Structure formats: C-alpha cells, structure tokens
From a paper:
Our research group has been studying a representative FAD-dependent dehydrogenase complex (FADGDH) derived from [name] SM4 (BcGDH). Owing to the presence of the β-subunit, BcGDH is capable of transferring electrons directly to an electrode, making it an ideal molecule for glucose sensors and applications in a variety of biomedical devices. In this study, we determined the X-ray structure of BcGDHγα, consisting of the BcGDH catalytic subunit complexed with the small (hitchhiker) subunit. The structure of BcGDHγα revealed a conserved GMC oxidoreductase-type scaffold and a His/Asn catalytic pair, with a unique structure of the 3Fe–4S cluster, which serves as the electron acceptor of FAD and simultaneously serves as the electron donor for electron transfer of the multiheme c subunit.
In the crystal, two pairs of BcGDHγα complexes were observed in the asymmetric unit. Therefore, the observed γαγ′α′ heterotetramer in the crystal structure is an artifact of crystallization. FAD is surrounded by part of the long loop between Ala98 and Ser109, α1, α15, β2 and β6. Since continuous electron density was observed between FAD and His105 in the α-subunit of BcGDHγα [Fig. 2(b)], a covalent bond was deemed to form between FAD and His105 in the α-subunit of BcGDH. The simulated-annealing OMIT maps of sulfur ions in the iron–sulfur cluster and the disulfide bond indicated that this iron–sulfur cluster is a 3Fe–4S cluster coordinated by Cys212, Cys218 and Cys222 of the α-subunit. A neighboring cysteine, Cys213, in the α-subunit forms a disulfide bond with Cys152 of the γ-subunit. The unique cysteine cluster of BcGDHγα contributes to the formation of the 3Fe–4S cluster for electron transfer and the disulfide bond for stabilization of the structure of the γα complex. The γ-subunit tightly binds the α-subunit and forms a stable heterodimer. The distance between N5 of FAD and the 3Fe–4S cluster is about 12–13 Å, which is an adequate distance for electron transfer. The catalytic pair in BcGDH is likely to be His/Asn, represented by His476 and Asn519, and corresponds to His689 and Asn732 in cellobiose dehydro­genase.
Numbering used by the authors:
A (entry chain B): 10 to 539
B (entry chain A): 52 to 165
Amino acid sequence: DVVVVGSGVAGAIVAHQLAMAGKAVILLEAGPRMPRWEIVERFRNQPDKMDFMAPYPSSPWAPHPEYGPPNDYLILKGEHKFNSQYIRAVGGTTWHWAASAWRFIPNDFKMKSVYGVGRDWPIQYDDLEPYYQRAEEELGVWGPGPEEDLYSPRKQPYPMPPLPLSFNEQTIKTALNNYDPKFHVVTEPVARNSRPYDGRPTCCGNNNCMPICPIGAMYNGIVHVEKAERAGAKLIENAVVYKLETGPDKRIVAALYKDKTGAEHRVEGKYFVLAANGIETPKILLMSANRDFPNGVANSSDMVGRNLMDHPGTGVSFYASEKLWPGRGPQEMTSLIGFRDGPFRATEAAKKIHLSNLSRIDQETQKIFKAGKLMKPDELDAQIRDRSARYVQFDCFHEILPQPENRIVPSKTATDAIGIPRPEITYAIDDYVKRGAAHTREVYATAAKVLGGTDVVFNDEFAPNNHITGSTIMGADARDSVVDKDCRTFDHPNLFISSSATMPTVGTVNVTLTIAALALRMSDTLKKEV
Amino acid sequence: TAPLDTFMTLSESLTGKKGLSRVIGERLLQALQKGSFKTADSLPQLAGALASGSLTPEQESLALTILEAWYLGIVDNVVITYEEALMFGVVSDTLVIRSYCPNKPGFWADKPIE
Ligand SMILES: *Cc1cc2c(cc1C)nc1c(=O)[nH]c(=O)nc-1n2C[C@H](O)[C@H](O)[C@H](O)COP(=O)(O)OP(=O)(O)OC[C@H]1O[C@@H](n2cnc3c(N)ncnc32)[C@H](O)[C@@H]1O
Ligand code: F3S
C-alpha cells in the first residue's frame, strides 16, 4: 500500500497518519532498534559527554558520521566541511536533538522576491500555519504567549506554557533586552513537557537533552514509530534501501534494500515516501539511475543532492562577573531572535542567537587540572564552583543560501561494508554568511561587555548544526526543482519526499518543526489517494 | 601496607574527603597503573613528600593525576565512574548530574545560595 523509507519523525508521522486511516503501511529503517535505557547507559559510560553522537554506534550496515574520532563515512571536499551529524536507527536523529521547535517566519518563504537573493518557496506561511499548529500539538511543544512576539503569527496558543526560565537565562534575558530591546531575547519554543502530555512525563531537568533525555519528557522520533506500530504499520529494522525501481508507467514500482548481511530484498506497494534524511535520501535517489532515468530517479532537474544547506555556526564564551550557574533545567530555554529579519537580508545573513544553559562542571574542572597546579581541596572546590558558576556561552545559526554547487553525490570510488556507495559532500560557505557573521561577532562582544565578560574567547570557525536541507529542493516548475509544492516528485506522481531536503530555504532556526508540518500536510494529501 | 592502602590515604589527603570508596578506589588505582606509577616507590614516596615536606614538579604532577582521576572519574578516556566522580559532589547543592533528575523537580528559577 505505502512503503515509507526512514523511521525518523519525518517518516514516522506519515506512516502513523496513513495506518490510522486504515491503509496498510510498511516502514523501512536502515538501522537497528535500540531502546532508551541503552542509549542512556551508553551515555553514562562515554568519556566525552560533549560528543552527542557517541552513545549512538554506527552499525556496519547502516553507518552514520562520527568525529570522536573520525570514522570517515562522509567524504568531505570543497572549501568547508559538512560535518553535520545524524543517527541511523529506529526513531532517527531526534533521539539526540535539543527539541527546539520553531516556525519559519513569513519572509523566509519569499526570499528572492523580497530580498532578491536565494529563492522563494512556492507555498507561503499562510499555507503552513495550521500544520505548524498540528505539528506542535503532535510533538508536544511549549512556548510563550502574547507577552513575547516570535514573529510567526499564530491562530492558537502553544499547547503548553514554558516551565520557568532558569536563573541563568532569565537574568540574561533581562539584562540583554535592557541594553538593547532590538535583540528581543525571548523564551524558546521546544518539544518538551511542562506537564504530563500524550503519556509522557513532565521535564525534570536532567540537563541532558542532547544526547538523551532518560525519561522522554521531550519529544523523540520514536514516539510516532511506536504510534505507527500500534496503528498497524509494519516496522522492518535493519533494512537499508539502495534502489527504487521505476515501472513502465513512469511511476515507482519497488524499493530494493539490503539487510545487515548485504543480502538483497524487494518491497512493493502503491505509494512511496522517502524520509531518509537530507543526505541519505539524495543518495538513494541517484543510486537508482536506470534505463528510463539515466540521471537517477527524480533528477530530470539535475538538482538532486544539490542546493545543500545547513546553519553555519559561530560562538562566544567568557566568565561573567555575576554568578549564573548554567546547567539547571534544560540545555536551552531561550533565544535572541531580533536578527532573523531585516532589509539587511539582501546584503548579508540573518541569524538566531542562543545562550547555552548546559552544565559546565566537567569542562571547568578539566580546565583547572590543565593549569598543572596542585591546590588544597578547598581552593580547588572554591574555584570549580566559581568557574562553573560564571561561564557563559552564546552560539548562533546563520542562514546559508541554496547553492547548486553545494551538493551531495554518491561516491564513484568509496563504499561501505555492504557495498553501498558513500556520501560525497562538496560544500563552501560564501561571503553572504561571512558578512552576517561579522555583525554577530559584534553582538557577541557587546553581550560580553554588558555581562562583565572576562576571558572572552571568540569562536569564529563555522560549526555544523545538523540541519540538513535543500537536497531535493521544492519548486514551482520541475526543472530547477525536484518536488512540487506538495512534496510530490515531478518525475514520479507516486513518490513523495518527507524531509528537510525539500525545503528550498534553511532560514534562521532549527528545521525539524517545519518538517513535522510538511509531513502532516503530505499525509493529508496522500490520505486522499485511496 | 599494600598499594591500595597508600593510594587511599593519599587520595584522602589530596581530596580532603573522608570516606572515599575503596571499591572505586581500587578501580582507579588499576586504571592509573596502566601507565602511571613507574616504580613501586612512587606512591609511598609521594605520601611522605606530601604529608610533610614538598614536591618535585614531577611529584606535584603525580598528585594532580591522582586528583584528576577522583574528580573526573575518568582515566585515559575510560569512565571508571560517573555518579561518584567527586566534582559533582562539590556542586551537588545546586547542579545536577546530567541524566539524573533532582528528587523534587522544577527547582531552577531560584538563584543558588552560596
Ligand atoms: C544531531 C542533532 C540534531 C538536531 C539537534 C541537536 C543535535 C545534537 N537539535 C535540533 C533542534 O533543536 N531542532 C531541530 O529542529 N532539529 C534539531 N536537530 C536535527 C534533527 O534531529 C533533524 O532535523 C531531524 O531528525 C530530521 O528528521 P528526519 O526524520 O527527516 O531525519 P532523521 O531523524 O535523521 O531520520 C531519518 C531516518 O531515515 C533512516 N534512513 C536513512 N537512510 C536510509 C536508507 N537508505 N534506508 C533505510 N533507512 C534510512 C535513518 O536510519 C533515520 O532513522
Ligand atoms: S533531557 Fe530530559 S527531563 Fe528535561 S531538560 Fe532535557 S528534557
């Protein structure tokens, strides 16, 4: 009936919707089923608790990127590393996310028209709103009410209100908004429970959201996998897909997948949804070149794997003069959103900026022992407490504009343990981002000044942020674009792509709520095809 | 007086904490032995120099290494323990150990009391 490929959120929502409307479903997950208690124990037993991939092993047959230390799965060329993370396992990469759950703002959808750069969406905010709201309700998202304007106009209030801000984050909101109300520091919307919700407990302040909440007080992809399964979808773990076959009638006829042995298998149904992620999905597509489609399925555009995007990151850290004590409650409760929009967006990149509320005991204890100076236990404790108390760090997402030379292709040369080719990402970061970043570095310096900042360190190397978007871009017309404004493939009237791959613009904020929205949209549209 | 005995009394002096666990102490010892404490004279010599007089940079640096292990709970990028790592007890009044709830919940709006 429907084969869905990818058991993350993008694809589990879809699977759950349809198997609810009775129409029988098959969900293929490359990775294995690993339960929460195991991820947790793996975390407790990892030596660098700042490595958010570390408690998620790459299966030989369905590997994913690692960097503590490198496993080399991705082939990175170009001028910059696309060292984003993701997880291959039942439930997908939102095992390990922060559950930041934003909406894009209206102008984000009309970037060339309005700002004369990048590239419009076909649909616009209006069209997405009611799906945002449904996504918020399905994920369980809390957020502020009318006392704070998040610049994406709402029909309903948030399903939940925030838990109170930590001292750290409220004090800094108050101080920063008092220096410059332009900054508009606000409480951040997040897929996390301020009360018992859809059967999940309220948030307790494990301060471990990356890389696992132990109790599921925040949303994880697994929630809708389990939903889909009770609603009668068939989960097949360790089924890693490497080809879709195109049938005579131009549609999609089957998906081919290797198990953990390298042995090959074949799955048929009526409709096909790729919700692999923004890398593995292009990869499957081009692995699938064949007689009638010499350029790889859905790629009459030449745009598949292309347009690849993520939020080039940039940071500051210092010791504040006031005590603040990061590490209490969630790792992020707040954001500084006053530069998501502006005329400047024609010249240079917009950002969201966010203060970290991560515990820094380890970090700052480690630091002190590096100074190579024996202390009386009392000095040592005094200092651990003080340093851990006063550390502050800001990071940020910059927008990067969709660019066709930024792309992922399946390696001609390199391969994995079961004989599937490997992602080869070319990627560069141009002056649009870099001029945005120069302004950010000034906000940072000002934040430091305001907060009595000491030992200020600027982090000017662009970090990844795991927001993998572009690679099957969304279009009006089917040749500079892969999917219509419904995430139907232009080339295959029975293939949809549920992923941030589809998003032509990456905007200023975490992309996953938008995905959840598109997923529900798609699932409506598909519910109509008997 | 075996190596453990000396280790344990050493660590007490260095950490200032009474009632350090010998079960964990054993494990830290054995991991530290992989590639520290060249001799068998090191531990005793460290105790005497510490207890009374004063330390070579090298001796200082051994003491640090011992301290490092108790406070971080890790030795050569292996976790010996997580809960009982001492840095957490130094801030247990205010900060949680990541992945462990406070026994009563949403506490964190307060400014901590010094
Ligand atoms: C790493 C990370 C990511 C992250 C984050 C923090 C961290 C540390 N914080 C986020 C946040 O605050 N807000 C947000 O919106 N996103 C955040 N992210 C990224 C987020 O996890 C992703 O955007 C999200 O997971 C995307 O959802 P999607 O379902 O599209 O992708 P996925 O969760 O990676 O799931 C993909 C599944 O498909 C399977 N797969 C892949 N290839 C294949 C093949 N060939 N065959 C079969 N299955 C396949 C994967 O196994 C995976 O389960
Ligand atoms: S990991 Fe879990 S309970 Fe609260 S702050 Fe983070 S969600």
